[PDB]
DNA sequence: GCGCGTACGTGCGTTTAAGCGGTGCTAGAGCTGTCTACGACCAATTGAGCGGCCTTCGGCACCGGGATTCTGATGGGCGGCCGCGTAT
C-alpha cells in the first residue's frame, strides 16, 4: 500500500528491484511529495504507470510523469 | 505517634480521535510602485509655568457672665439642770 512505503522504507529499500507497476497513479500530481521522491530512491531498472490521468490542466503533472521514468527529459 | 479511612495509582480491556502524509483552494501576507500629506526644522513673539513669598476665613476645642440653689451662724421661747443659797 502507499501508505506502508512510507512509514517502512528501509525494509522495501533495502531489497533490489526491476519492474514497478502501479494502479491508478494520479498520487504523483505533484513532483514535491514523499511517494514521490519514495518511489525513485528504490535502485529499479524499468517502471509502468498504469493509469488515466488528465495530463492536461497542468504541466507539472505530464512532466512529473516524463521525468519520473525519464530523469533529463523535458 | 498512631490509627482510621478512603482516595488515588496501577492494570486491562474497550474505545475514541490524534497524528500521518495526500491533495486542493484561495486568502491573506509581502512585495512593489507612485503621491503627497504631515512632521521635522529654523524663525520671532508671547504667556503659561516655576520659585519666592506670605493670606484669610472657618472649624475644633477650649471658654464667659449672670441668675439661682444649697449650706452656715443667728435667736426668741418653752423646758429642763438638780444644786448652792438666803430667810424664818
Redesign the pocket.
Given at each position: 500500500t502507499?501508505?506502508y512505503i512510507?512509514?517502512d522504507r528501509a525494509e522495501l529499500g533495502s531489497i533490489k528491484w526491476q519492474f514497478m507497476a502501479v494502479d491508478e497513479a494520479?498520487?504523483?500530481?505533484?513532483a514535491e511529495?514523499?511517494?514521490y521522491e519514495?518511489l525513485n530512491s528504490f535502485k529499479v531498472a524499468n517502471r509502468m504507470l498504469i493509469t488515466g490521468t488528465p495530463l492536461q490542466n497542468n504541466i507539472k503533472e505530464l512532466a512529473a510523469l516524463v521525468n519520473f521514468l525519464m530523469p533529463g527529459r523535458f
Open positions: 502507499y501508505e512510507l512509514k494520479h498520487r504523483l500530481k505533484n511529495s514523499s511517494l519514495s
